[model samples]
Target chain A: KSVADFWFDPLCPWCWITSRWILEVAKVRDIEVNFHVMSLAILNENRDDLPEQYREGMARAWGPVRVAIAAEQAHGAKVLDPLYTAMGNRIHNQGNHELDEVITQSLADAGLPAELAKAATSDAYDNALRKSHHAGMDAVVGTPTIHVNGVAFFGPVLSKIPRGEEAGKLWDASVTFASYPHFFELKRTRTEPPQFDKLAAALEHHHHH
Target chain B: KSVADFWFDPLCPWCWITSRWILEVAKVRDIEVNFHVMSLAILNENRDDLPEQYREGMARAWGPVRVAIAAEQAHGAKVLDPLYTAMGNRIHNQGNHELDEVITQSLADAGLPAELAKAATSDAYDNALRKSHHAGMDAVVGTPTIHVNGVAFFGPVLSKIPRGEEAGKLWDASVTFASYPHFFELKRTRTEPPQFDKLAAALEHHHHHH
Candidate 1:
């Protein structure tokens, strides 16, 4: 009945974890998520100060988000759900970021035209991409930035996602606190990193040379 | 009832909040708190390196803790509950740092000898004070450090205390997480400063210079 906007960069592992939780929230809470494209590539455009390894990751960040923008434009806004799901599953769950196969396969799986794969490099969709990015980045600085009823919060990060009644209770409590007028931020050092499915984690055979 | 050891430095307001939460946990979770003395004075012992303002606060930290050490020696360990409550109320609630009057009044109120007030400045209690301070600081680094069932944690720092079943639920959850094998620490930058009760906040009337 209600709608929330979630901004994400596909290369961010933590954002992927949050996206999974939001998917769970969708099943239990009466809210629809409007996923928007925000690219780390756009955020760090032509930045020369980035670390070598991080620069490598951000280099590939633009392609996935661009393809997401093109999917919505070519089809409709509803296509974003499946496209994001397909894209996130490959990057996070399957540990695959090769944009050509990844983007082409995701578009095909989402029942959209495979021609949209060129959106990864085509600058024609750049305006739509920037518009979508800026819409969610106002007053926010990070990926998986969520806005519910126009109030924004970065994260309520968890070591492990709750389930069943626990999930519902936490969702209720999170919504209550996020909507509080004086609420600013609550955070803690992350003790453990995001986890991928066991099979996906083990299946990666390539090494970063 | 399970016993939990709590450490404190009387000058820290956040420690006061944590001590209060432990009191609530005792009622709801059937835990008994064993209070011990650990002061910013001993923590920074004879350091020439601390900031001037912090050094000033730590300078007087020894007196209150010395009084605590003296109280336990004169009475028994059981006297710590009312004594700490009495001392904390004066310093944190009334903003009074005059330990001679505060310690004496607390002793009389907690049914101990009022003459023990001299413990505030007496060098005789220093060894007793050091021993008491070390008891809880062996595995922790902060005031309000608590050891529950031999598992230690810094805090469950909260802006406001939760009440009733909510308090019980949080205690249960905190215990579960803190006692977990992999649990190390959970902390965030505090957004707001500690608040005092209306009466406490209103009581300060002073002049620093003529």
Candidate 2:
């Protein structure tokens, strides 16, 4: 089994898309992804030129990442993937990332304590987020950076995440290509807007309940 | 110089992007690219279900491949690069692919005889076009297939071609990754519409004369 490190910002939709695809890869291949927090708020902290909308979004980003760091501290790194999965499903798929209730629901869904949601803006977990955020910044340019062992790159941006054998094949291709010592960046324009299939349906079903 | 084979059909915009980037790679690296004819018309010949506009585009594709084949047969393979470059610049960059005059001008500009434009509809060159088309089919799927040494892949698709040292660095990366025994496909959705920088301007200017 191989271990892959995925650097993520919980508020980034692109990272959510990439993380989902990586999970599909893990299912078919003997590989595991260790989730790590990377804060976009920290990444853009010093910049004053960002659009007001972007600046506001980054400012709000602190809550999710802080809880992610706190979750790792309280529960160890093993809870990260499930926690991230639950959080991403709620935010990206269900479109309910507006409040801390989303955090409480995600922790409960991931089998963590619902009370851990208080960690969202506790400031107590800021160091953990800073440590990973800087490490990620040192390596690549943006969110969804994956490292197969030591090899790293900016992105393999997907408009739609593939599944079944296509997912496995893409994972095989990703690992094989990213493993190459010289491989850096390969990209295409994103044509498909991100769509959260299962989470959208689940949320709609929850509304009926 | 190490020769790289590029399979192309002028009608494809993505192939145009890949071709441009490959040329950029050739400039900074010790490499040469040999342009080869691949007809999308013949590839889709058996399919009667393609959209009307797609079918029309494929029909128009035949003229360029036929002339390209005739040019290769008459002037040899060395002329393919300049000839392809000239035709690509006009068709892809200048948006001029409708008339035989365009082919005539391109052939002359590439330093070949303008009379070679007659080969656009010449039946004699169809065999040569079919031969290379099949050969390209055996190597990879779709246009813009790059064969470096003996390795081949579908694309190094980029929204914008990297320039200078970035182009050279990417070439090194592409060669290194493509050389792997197990590498197949790792792709993302293309978000940028293919913008023909010069072609768009050229077409805008053409409205004054037409």
Candidate 3:
């Protein structure tokens, strides 16, 4: 089982966008996932340790941003996998606004078993991550440090791209590589490596810039 | 749609091992496959196409060696999908006796209700390229040609080594990849740059030794 290291804050908009992409990716690829929740709030991030600026970063990170796109109010009811994953991704990555509830209500309004939402949302695992937010911040380095075997991969790998409301395609590809062994192997060995190069290059430039 | 060019024969023992693997793979990996059955007969540098030669090869390919290590087997009237897919891979990749019977049972066994075996053996559409003799020819030219759209790949990159059965892992990987958009994209992107040094060497060594 390969590690699917995921880090998010349910308070960072960009994190929400990338999370949406990554979650959608989980459907198409086969990989085991482990999630880490970061503290987006001042109280959450630097309560015991850091000084003001870093704490302010934490508050700014968690500050209320439009969690979802404008169209979510309308199309939010539809069930395209990437969309659902993106919404969940947004909740953790951006501002903790659960579009899932509204979408599920719409699904119920459309005649499905309303309880279906409860079942999906009830997967104790995701909530467990939220409950352990403090633990996640201490363990995970930054707002979006997706790790595998303690190897952190973030920033460029999850940078925002102005695609449709969804996360960037590169983020999806990165998540797929992070998740599927066969897919990862095929891409690494048989095909050209996905364009994570842009992400990697961006990271190199981020420090210098 | 890509051609599922296979290295399977009607009577290879390891090919018999992969049947269940193919089915289990279907659960997670999405793919619609057009199976191109291959032959086991090697003649000179190519597939032995003559009837007598091909049949003799089939006979030899159906070696009497028993599977020393077998995948878990269960006895239930209902078909277990994971088991079915798994066995499908083994049987297709390396089967002599069991594949024929398994397919017979899966497709036609009265319990299965579909009559797949009869359909394969009797129906016009199910005639499998003279038991992959054509597939053998493709393998000789290709050796193990797997394609997305029209181009081919030797093995999967995006797939992982599946957990349950070794026999069907390839099949599962194959079928799983079949459904991905990456299949065609891979074909268009892969420059056929990867080396088949070991495969080529194996073939050459076998030619000289066997």
Candidate 4:
């Protein structure tokens, strides 16, 4: 099985959508996905020109990602997928605005210690977080950067997630496009908002937020 | 069979390459490609700040597209493919810089009247040319804009032309991508120059311009 390396910033809605698509791809295609954490907070840090609401959002963004690095450092890499999914479902699907509650509950859901949430307000894990962030940013400057067979591209950037064979077909085509060394980008203006129908359906199935 | 409407200007090497790829697509898939004339000259007509060489090149560009429009109007639309193939071969493969000779020889090769070559320097067909040009430019800018099943998009912008099944696969993927109404562009910076190995091989087969 080929390995698909995906880097994401948990706060981005677009990244959440793309991450779901990659998981769909893994279910249908013979590929193993490895997830890594990258930071938008680090990416846009100290840029004074950003809008007031956006700058405040960026500052608030540091909480969950810092807690994520702390969890990975203490619990190990295997905890990340469940933790990310747990946090992402609440933040995106449930529209949870309380970062501290999201971090505490996500750790409990992933069977990690609640004390890890303390890392959210501390800079103790900032060095490791910066290291991981740069590793992904070195390839391309965005969340949801994926590398297939060592060739990295920013995104396929889907509006709606493809399931089953459609996901496989898109994966095959994406791999083919990425195999071309000169292929740097294939982008169009995104005309629609991200659709989270599958996630909403999953929430109903689980009977939890 | 699906109809692939391709808009092109004869002077662009990139358009020449894409035109060749679409022809390859026609060979492997059930598609009939209809060629239409669009002018880079008309596209960049009034821009006063273009580079000196590019501005001069744009001035010279009006000649061939005018001749193409004239040939299409006077002769039937059926004459366009042969005339384009003839002119493109000399202009791209043979590096033929003499516009008059290229126009005259190409018209002869397509079995047209030599007097039609005078349309190169004339503006009699500019109205027809502009009308055809806008029909394409309404979709997107730049050369080699292709519309598959009425969904128009700019170039796939290939470096090396895919042949046979590879061409068919690319076409399938492109059509699938275009089928999504929200799909607008899929582009990357072209790093390599266009490779014309097949055209070179074809030249050897004809034993014409070595």
Instruction: Give the candidate number with the greatest DockQ.
Output: 4
lDDT of 3 by residue, A160-207 (tens): 322332322433433433343223223212232222114543465488
- What DockQ was computed for model 3? 0.07
Candidate 4 clashes between residue pairs 3 or more apart in a chain or in different chains: A185-B187, A186-B187
Deviation from native of the Cα of residue A110 in model 2, angstroms: 1.7
Candidate 3 residue spans exceeding 4 A from truth: A1-209, B1-31, B42-58, B62-145, B157-210
Compose the digit string of candidate 1's lDDT tens values, residues A1-209.
65667787767776676666677777888887887777777777755656566887777777888888888887888888788878877777787878777888888878888788887787888888888878876655555566766666665454454445555445555555444342233232345776654453455434322
Worst 10 residues of 2 chain A by lDDT: A180-189
TM-score between model 1 and native? 0.69
Write model 4 residue lDDT over B1-210, tens digit each, in one string. Answer: 677788888787777877877889888898878999989998788566677788777788888888889999898778888898888887877778788888999999999998888898888999999999888766654655777777776666666767777777777776666655533443444668876656665866588554
Instruction: Return the candidate ranking by lDDT, descending.
Output: 4, 2, 1, 3
Q: Which stretches of candidate 2 lie over 4 Å from their true place?
A: A52-54, A203-208, B1-210
Name the DockQ score for candidate 2.
Answer: 0.06
Each model's lDDT comes to: 0.68, 0.71, 0.37, 0.77
Model 1 score (lDDT): 0.68
Which prediction has the highest lDDT against the true structure? 4
What TM-score would chain A of each candidate receive against the reference chain A? 0.85, 0.88, 0.38, 0.90
**Best candidate per TM-score, number?**
4
Q: Locate the minimum summed-lDDT window of 10 residues in model 2 chain B.
A: B180-189
